[model samples]
Target: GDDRELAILATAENLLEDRPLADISVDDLAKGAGISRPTFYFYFPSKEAVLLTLLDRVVNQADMALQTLAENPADTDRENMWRTGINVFFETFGSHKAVTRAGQAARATSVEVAELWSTFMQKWIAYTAAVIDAERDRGAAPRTLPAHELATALNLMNERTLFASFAGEQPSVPEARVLDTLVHIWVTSIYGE
Candidate 1:
């Protein structure tokens, strides 16, 4: 069987270096990859599919990182979880900046992509919520707000941080300082002054 899918991705990634995802054409990709338009179609139904593959790769990497954090008992700092998690997150996104930028752009342009992005976010929220619940059990964090509510707040902060970073509007502070500030804010907001 022909591995046109890998060929398409290689061509798409090369194109992304010079062009926005929305501007790339199937014909251009086909020509660059030395494949016919029909062969490209056989591998990917649309340009979006190629972009989706990239998005999935990034998402999966983030997912695995979160899962490892969630399963570890050593990451139990109440105020530091936010900082640690966000630091890990930014590092992950930084490594895949191009694919992440494409995914963000795709989400803005397509409702389906937005939904997919939302699903990933919801999972992140759930994971954060679970961590909060664990902290509550360990008497490390206050139990004033329910786990779900606290999770929502933490998730909101994370999403804002991510969007800000992606938009080049992140705080001027160094990465460690920004993470520490975010973690402190989250802890104080949830547990009171």
Candidate 2:
């Protein structure tokens, strides 16, 4: 049943909470979903597949938010746009720690994991670049750097920072400061003081 699909996803989310992905076996996931190990393969190719699916779910939400903002450029306030956009990343990733951590860790070992992530980064970079270009066209933002180049740099930074925060890396910025710091950086860098 289609419900089995959700069951496996939910199981992965719960299992990742207390242990790293390496510690969770396909058997663990299958059993949790009330299916056999072989059946797990029928739904997902591997544990990393499940992790990537979860990652995609969260990132897709962020992309949807940005798309809505893009839908009405004239109505988009720059600072508020960056603030809310960054917050959406923080909020979604913060609430899904297990999935975030597992996905980040899998990037090193799984080409699919790494490729899916870069795919999202490319999409966001293009979207942000368009916004920056529009702002420059309207004289709302300065032309200090090329729009596409700056957007690539900023969005890449956001991806790393958010992953580091949720992956529990040392020397990472505190969760409380991430949103404000990111918003300020985007606003000041894109629009000036």
Candidate 3:
């Protein structure tokens, strides 16, 4: 069941590569997957639903990758874990750049899309908070800012880097660089580094 839904998502993603998501009709997706429009609806209620499903897949992949990194102690140094997580995130998004671009473009035009983006960012902030808590326990991170504030600042920085990179105006620096710079900023701002 999951595989079949994933197949539809993959087909939709392939179509996205050639055109914007808004331009790709249900007929196109159904035809691409050799399924009827009714069958497509059986799996996803709307185009946005399909996109959300794909987004969930990427997010789950990032979560699992982080868990794997955490399990392997040699790879779980605070800074390295942060870098690995961010790198996996960006790499996954880069693989679906066209879909991401379409979502960004649609956000201003669609209230639902905007809300979806906000919700997605909130989940990321929560995840970051959990990671920061772990680092603090390990004495790798300071307990200067409360978890929420630290997570918020880090999340903002993460978004800034991702957006800048996606825009192609200037490439985003490596996650290691961002983590180093942000940690300095956090320390200076919160604990007088």
Candidate 4:
């Protein structure tokens, strides 16, 4: 049945909590979900496919908080608004560590993994770039290497550091410090400290 699709996704995400993607197999997922091996393929081609879907399930398709940041720009509420946006993204990233780490681990060796991750990163960069440009248009952000380019540089840094830092455990620094540094960088870079 179509409902079987949820079984695969759930089992894969739950299973990933303790192990990497390589250690999990289609048979293992199928059994964990109480479905036949062929049934698993009927829903997902393989374990990586399952991982990809899990990542999507954890995050919103749109960055609504960032949209709010773009709309509000510099204001009495700017810090609160900016922190809200950055924290939401980090919460998404932090809470789904296993699946995200799996995605990163597989990307170096699998085309499917690489594409899924790069696609998400590109989407993030594009949206954040728009917000930077919006602020720049309002004279909130200073002109530099173009709004989009600066956004790309900052985002890739955030993406790469978050990916690597979350690979093993949480950040070496306190979660608050780590998050503050990230939001601080984005804030200062785009709008000046």
Candidate 5:
């Protein structure tokens, strides 16, 4: 049947770039993808499915990027990596701000989405913890707190702060401010200098 699929998930993400996910319909998604309504069903059972699938695509890539980046030494190399990573992060997030907003809004209503997102952050937390552990072992970061806990706190800070500052039509603050503040927090918190 070739599944009659044609970037249905991609089309859904495109539609979500500026509109509410709830506002988009199966028919609208099909039309946006230049397919039939039934064809949309052939590809995805529901909009949530499409959303999760699209998120998974980028999330998986991002995780891999961070995982590999986390392997570098957390001193100069790690700081550079974090700065570059967060910059790309904000850029990618800004591009898909609408989807990020919906993912958060839908978590409470959709348990599947909840777990999917939890796993997403959890992976980042682990990656961050690994990096912080290297810093702690080398006397760069404090070793009193569990690496995982400290990493979780800082990673959550980035998540909450980044989305809060940049995930809407109008950011609460300028993007450069967001980037500077985030890099300041990460660099000082990790290296003390």
Candidate 6:
């Protein structure tokens, strides 16, 4: 089986550990993967594409955590779901700090990466909105801001908060209490006191 494609991705991940994506070249990735430069293009259009694919995998894992919570309608502990979902997100993103940080930085300059991020953001926002509407319909949550609007704000908040802390930006939330802080905001906003 030809594993060159996987090898390129793996090479990119390894290179990112010590250097940012901007510092990594296609030649480096191709050679590290034991392939030629043209072969690298055949596998990925550019180094950014390789990074994007890896970031997608990271996002998919976090999405699965939310999908599980949604599928379990029988679970009435919404607060716990929030806790677990947020924790899974942090853990998944944290473990891949290099890729995650690079992807975050790339989003600012790469239209393709920015579009991909917007698509993921939209998916999470829609899912959260649906949950909010369902909760209100069942009288589990009181009406506040429009469901869609509220979901958008909260989801964006999560994106910014996670990006900042993961990238080690100054004045970012501390790791020790970030989870609790996020959970508190989410639970209180949706479930109230």
C-alpha local distance difference test of each model: 0.75, 0.84, 0.69, 0.73, 0.74, 0.85
Candidate 1 lDDT tens digits, 1-193: 3466777788888788677887899999899888899988888899998888877877878888867776674546556666667666777876766777778778878777788789988888787777767767887677787778777777777666665665466364454455666777777866672
Among all windows of ten consecutive residues in candidate 4, which has the lowest summed lDDT? 59-68
TM-score of each: 0.81, 0.91, 0.71, 0.82, 0.84, 0.90
Estimate the overall C-alpha local distance difference test score of candidate 1.
0.75
Question: How much is 6 displaced in model 3, in angstroms?
Answer: 3.5
**Candidate ordering by TM-score (highest first):** 2, 6, 5, 4, 1, 3
**How high is the lDDT of residue 177 in model 4?**
65
Q: Which candidate number has the best TM-score?
A: 2
Select the stronger candidate by lDDT from 2 and 4. Answer: 2
- Model 4 residue 65 distance off true place after TM-score fit, in angstroms: 6.3
Please identify which of the two predictions, 3 or 6, would achieve the higher lDDT against the true structure.
6
Compared with the true structure, what per-residue lDDT tens digits does model 2 show for residues 112-183? 889988898888888788878888899888888888899998988887887777776896878778888788
lDDT value, residue 120 of candidate 1: 85
Worst ten in a row by lDDT for model 6: 68-77
Cand. 4 TM to true fold: 0.82
Error of 2 at 69 (Å): 3.1
Off by over 4 Å in 3: 1-4, 75-78, 105-120, 130-143, 167-192
Q: Write the per-residue lDDT of candidate 4 for residues 36-134, one digit (tens) a residue.
A: 998888888878778777766654433554555567665556556667777766777788887777766777887866776677668777887877777
**In candidate 3, what are the lDDT values of residues 153-176, reduced to their tens digit?**
867776677656665645676543
Mark the regions of model 6 whose C-alpha exceeds 4 Å error after superposition.
73-76
lDDT per residue (tens digit) for residues 47-152 in model 6: 9889989988888887887787667644647787778777877888888888888888898988978988888889889988998899899999999889999899
lDDT of 2 at 19: 97
